[PDB]
Amino acid sequence: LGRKIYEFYNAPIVKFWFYTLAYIGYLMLFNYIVLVKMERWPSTQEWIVISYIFTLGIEKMREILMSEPGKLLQKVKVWLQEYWNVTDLIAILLFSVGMILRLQDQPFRSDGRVIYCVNIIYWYIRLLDIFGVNKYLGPYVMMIGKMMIDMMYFVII
Amino acid sequence: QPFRSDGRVIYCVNIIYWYIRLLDIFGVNKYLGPYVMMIGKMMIDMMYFVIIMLVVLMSFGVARQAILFPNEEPSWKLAKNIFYMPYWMIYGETGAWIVPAIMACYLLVANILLVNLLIAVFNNTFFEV
Amino acid sequence: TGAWIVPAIMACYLLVANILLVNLLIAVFNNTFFEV
Ligand SMILES: Cc1cc(NC(=O)[C@H](c2ccccc2)N2CCCc3ccccc32)no1
């Protein structure tokens, strides 16, 4: 029975859906902490959000430190050749910066709330990757991808 | 009262379906029927597009409220404010203004992307039908 | 004589330019969905 639970929890489909449910949990909790206030110290669900981001940073760190090249700069470079992974690093750094601005007193609470207001924009646009798996949403995402370039040249015009 | 009041409401919900019941019959005419089947395929295409619409428009809605009214206590009307007011955001308009600027230009480019995506989808759907 | 004239020229120009740019978006984005 223990082997059955172990085989179920190491299947990639289970890891996918199980990460996705925790990610939906993240999005609802982070919605709650951005619509409702902040205080001198963070609320409990905001601390949950901070632990999400911190352990995500640690996971990205071992993604750096368990790649196939053996020279560390090559590990960092190959890890930074994927666009979504680059913006993941960028977002973790602004969310940390927003944390340091949030912990410092007024007028820094407002700027921390601004940074956490930009983070919900990025952490809903992160969903397009995962979406690119469903048989109907994937071509839609790829159209948005090419429409970036086409709409960009239309912005110049 | 008040049972007659919401009974009339349930009747007024029923009127919707008692007109949509006409699509079946509209399927005998040589020109109405392919159109009805276009509603038929466009419903699933629109459903997946509503998934995309929630992912993009809801980030803009929550971002607007977060950058807007900061002094609203826990209530279920906040969920109403995050897709009621940005549904009528056309009525609306330090770095300071820079943050809403990013939000505003993101709203315009997002509206352009999704609306033209939707017209492209519904135009491609015409081919198979 | 020039009180209304050149506002009308500018408004008509903005209207026609807005139309051709919007349908430019329409046609270019109809092509993109075909390839993908
Ligand atoms: C905080 C935070 C973010 C997050 N989710 C992800 O950012 C992402 C993901 C996205 C959608 C569904 C499931 C997971 N994810 C989590 C773990 C690291 C990683 C590696 C490659 C691809 C995705 C991925 N969970 O908490």
What does the DSSP assignment read for chain C?
-TTTHHHHHHHHHHHHHHHHHHHHHHHHHHHHHHH-
- Alpha-carbon gap, residue A65 to A79, rounded angstroms: 9
Instruction: Inform me whether the C-beta atom of residue C33 falls under 8 Å from chain A C-beta atoms.
Output: yes
Helix (H) or strand (E) holding A134: none
Looking at ligand 1, which residue's alpha carbon is closest to its atom 15?
A19
- Alpha-carbon gap, residue B72 to C2, rounded angstroms: 52
Q: What's B87's DSSP letter?
A: G
What's the distance, Cα to Cα, between the start and end of chain B in Å?
49
What sign does the dihedral B121-B90-B56-A118 (CA atoms) show?
positive
Calculate how close chain B gets to C6, using CA atoms only, in Å.
27
Residue with tokens 């109809």: C30
Dihedral Cα B49, B53, B56, B62, nearest 10 deg: -160
Structure tokens at A34: 């951005």
Nearest residue in chain C measured CA to CA from A151: C25
- Alpha-carbon gap, residue B55 to B83, rounded angstroms: 12
Asked if B55 contacts B114 with a C-beta cutoff of 8 angstroms, the reply is no
- Alpha-carbon gap, residue C18 to B112, rounded angstroms: 13
Distance, C-alpha A114 to centroid of its chain: 17
Q: What's A107's DSSP letter?
A: T
- Alpha-carbon gap, residue B99 to A131, rounded angstroms: 28
Residue with tokens 């890891």: A15
Structure tokens at B27: 């399927």
Residue type, B82: I
Distance, C-alpha B89 to centroid of its chain: 13
Q: What's A154's DSSP letter?
A: H
- Alpha-carbon gap, residue B99 to A73, rounded angstroms: 35
Structure tokens at C24: 């430019």
CA distances from B33 to B1, B36, B38, B77 (A): 44, 5, 9, 42
Q: What's B97's DSSP letter?
A: T
Count of beta carbons in the 10 Å neighbourhood of residue A127: 21
Closest CA to A50 of A7, A100, A99: A99
Question: Among partner residues B59, B70, B113, which is closest to A144 by beta-carbon distance?
Answer: B113
Count of beta carbons in the 10 Å neighbourhood of residue A145: 13
Backbone angles phi, psi at B30, to 5 degrees: -65, -20
- Alpha-carbon gap, residue B107 to A126, rounded angstroms: 17
Nearest-Å Rg of the Cα atoms of chain A is: 19
Chain B residues closer than 8 Å to A113 by CB = 66, 70
- Alpha-carbon gap, residue A128 to C21, rounded angstroms: 28
- Alpha-carbon gap, residue C36 to A154, rounded angstroms: 20
- Alpha-carbon gap, residue C36 to C32, rounded angstroms: 7
SS3 state of residue A30: helix
Distance, C-alpha C2 to centroid of its chain: 25
- Alpha-carbon gap, residue B66 to B72, rounded angstroms: 10
> Do you find a cis peptide bond into A107, omega within 30 degrees of 0?
yes
Asked if C6 contacts B96 with a C-beta cutoff of 8 angstroms, the reply is no
- Tell how far the Cα of A130 is from the centroid of ligand 1, in angstroms: 9
CA A49 to ligand 1: nearest atom: 1
Asked if B116 contacts C25 with a C-beta cutoff of 8 angstroms, the reply is yes
Asked if A121 contacts A91 with a C-beta cutoff of 8 angstroms, the reply is no
Q: Residue A20: CB within 6 Å of ligand 1?
A: yes
Contact between A121 and B82 using a beta-carbon 8 Å cutoff: no
Q: Residue A49: CB within 6 Å of ligand 1?
A: no
Helix (H) or strand (E) holding A126: none
Dihedral Cα A53, A59, A64, A65, nearest 10 deg: 140
Instruction: Using an 8 Å CB-CB cutoff, list residues of chain B that contact chain C.
Output: 112, 116-117, 119-121, 123-124
Residue type, B108: L
Contact between A154 and C33 using a beta-carbon 8 Å cutoff: no
Instruction: Using an 8 Å CB-CB cutoff, list residues of chain C that contact chain B.
Output: 25-26, 29-30, 32-34
Closest CA to A101 of A38, A154, A30: A38
Question: Among partner residues A124, A134, A143, which is closest to B120 by beta-carbon distance?
Answer: A143
Largest separation between any pair of C-alpha atoms in chain B: 65
- Alpha-carbon gap, residue A67 to A58, rounded angstroms: 15
Chain A residues closer than 8 Å to B104 by CB = none
Taken as a whole, chain B contains a residue count of 129
Contact between B120 and A34 using a beta-carbon 8 Å cutoff: no
> Ligand 1: which of A19, A54, A63, A123 to mutate, most ligand atoms within 8 Å of CB?
A19
